[PDB]
């Protein structure tokens, strides 16, 4: 079984006092706290074995390169990819989506084509495709939303045509916690000739993800949202497509020869999309966090998180004039608004009570405009949050409702 006490024992920030009170971090969706294991992994790699990682000659460099490739293999086993050479290291889901849009996009989308996204999509899953459409001259069609935070799938027949090139969809929505039918939408997309990219920046930390079961052609996620360090993230690409995509950033490592009179040639897959010195410590920490989460078992995490979400949704009914956004079966996050009170005030107060929630548009403004609001308050229910923190949040919401 799962024991949130032992788990919280490992995150040191969970001992901070925010504004004179013990901190209750409810913004893991914005970024997850890192256990002591990941901090120590990174810091130890730094202390007793740091060196360059470009197949160097001396022992330390070759060991560091081995370590980085082992981390890549662990990450490939995580999502269940066929080959470790189908995962590229990036800065995060944002840079991964940009890379896919520039590399694969600029060579696979032209004038007259069209790209399909959802109205719930994060800005990271919206802006790159807009830039691409503006560059090549393609159309961007949006999957509408239903009031309950789910996709109007019945509109799919009128959005996919012989010219649909890509479906960039979100796995778990970082605002509504909705989970889209990835396999079915992906089957429909593959029936037309349009690839599929999946933004799972929010889905990985809750349940197991199987890039071969979804058949998605691109999958992305960020490391700071998986209890690991920042600056690192994973972009999985089907080997078939990845072996044919040109290079994005240009420099050292990703090349095979560099001549000022005979041109330049590029290296094989994964590395061709990893210019300059990679974030070695970040990769060490990301592997450490992967090992941690796997040791805890994603299914126990998901069971605990679903029970905690049900408890919190039951408790938030005793808050008058609260308005929630998303389906009942949401994951990880609750978006809401306390009466006619602006989200900024609800959040400022909650934080003055030591409670940390995110307030505003959450890099998902089209969602806001759909919902006819200017902002929302999101709270994250991570694996290290307790029922007592849910009670503190309901308490703060009720006291704010009174005082306002």
């Amino acid at each position: 079984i799962f024991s949130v006490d032992k788990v919280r024992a490992d995150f040191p920030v969970l001992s901070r006092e925010v504004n004179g009170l013990p901190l209750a971090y409810l913004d893991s969706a914005a970024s997850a706290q890192k256990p002591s294991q990941v901090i120590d992994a990174e810091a130890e790699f730094y202390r007793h074995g740091y060196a360059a990682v470009h197949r160097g000659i001396h022992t330390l460099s070759a060991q560091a390169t081995e370590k980085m490739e082992n981390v890549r293999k662990r990450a490939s086993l995580f999502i269940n990819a066929r080959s470790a050479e189908e995962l590229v290291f990036v800065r995060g889901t944002t840079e991964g989506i940009n890379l896919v849009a520039n590399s694969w996009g600029n060579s696979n989308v032209r004038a007259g084509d069209n790209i399909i996204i959802s109205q719930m999509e994060h800005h990271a899953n919206i802006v790159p495709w807009q830039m691409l459409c503006a560059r090549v001259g393609a159309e961007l069609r949006v999957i509408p939303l239903n009031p309950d935070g789910t996709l109007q799938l019945e509109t799919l027949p009128t959005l996919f045509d012989e010219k649909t090139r890509l479906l960039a969809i979100t796995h778990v929505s970082n605002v509504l916690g909705t989970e889209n039918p990835l396999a079915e939408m992906i089957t429909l997309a593959h029936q037309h000739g349009a690839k599929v990219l999946v933004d799972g920046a929010q889905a990985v930390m809750h349940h197991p993800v199987d890039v071969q079961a979804l058949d998605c052609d691109f999958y992305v996620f960020s490391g700071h949202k998986l209890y690991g360090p920042t600056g690192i993230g994973i972009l999985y690409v089907k080997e078939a497509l990845l072996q044919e995509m040109p290079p994005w950033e240009g420099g050292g490592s990703m090349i095979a020869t560099v001549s000022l009179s005979e041109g330049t040639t590029w290296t094989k897959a994964p590395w061709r999309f990893e210019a300059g010195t990679p974030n070695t410590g970040g990769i060490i920490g990301l592997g450490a966090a992967l090992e941690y989460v796997s040791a805890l078992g994603l299914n126990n995490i998901a069971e605990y998180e679903q029970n905690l979400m049900h408890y919190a949704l039951s408790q938030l009914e005793s808050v008058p004039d609260l308005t929630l956004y998303g389906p009942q079966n949401r994951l990880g996050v609750i978006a809401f608004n306390l009466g006619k009170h602006h989200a900024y005030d609800v959040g400022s107060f909650l934080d003055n009570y030591g409670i940390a929630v995110r307030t505003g548009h959450h890099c998902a403004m089209p969602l806001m405009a759909y919902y006819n609001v200017p902002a929302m308050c999101r709270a994250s229910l991570a694996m290290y949050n307790t029922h007592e923190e849910v009670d503190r949040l309901v308490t703060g919401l009720q006291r704010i409702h009174r005082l306002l």
Partner: protein, 131 residues
Amino acid sequence: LLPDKEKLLRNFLRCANWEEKYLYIIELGQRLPELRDEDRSPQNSIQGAQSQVWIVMRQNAQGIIELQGDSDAAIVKGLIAVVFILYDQMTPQDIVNFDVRPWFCKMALTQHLSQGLEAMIRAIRAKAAAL
């Protein structure tokens, strides 16, 4: 109406805790007169405060400056009112040369909240200097 900078700082320091201070700010914002729907336009919108903010400045029948404001956020409107108080009954040059820093320091706002108020003050000072 709104109290003067003297009574404002006094009644603020007289608050017993930070909750009372924040609620007093929300209230001060509540006191601000309603903004004309015409003035609630992009030409009068401010940016950088994380919430919709409109601040219109105009010289009355004299060289004196009159300020109207609004913000979709309660505490933001309260800060608008605090500013209006600090810049109350002053000509463009008097606003250009008035040091609001010691007032906020004696109110300790950057330590309990920080940049949106800075942006509002910058916009008001830009208007006053243009005048």
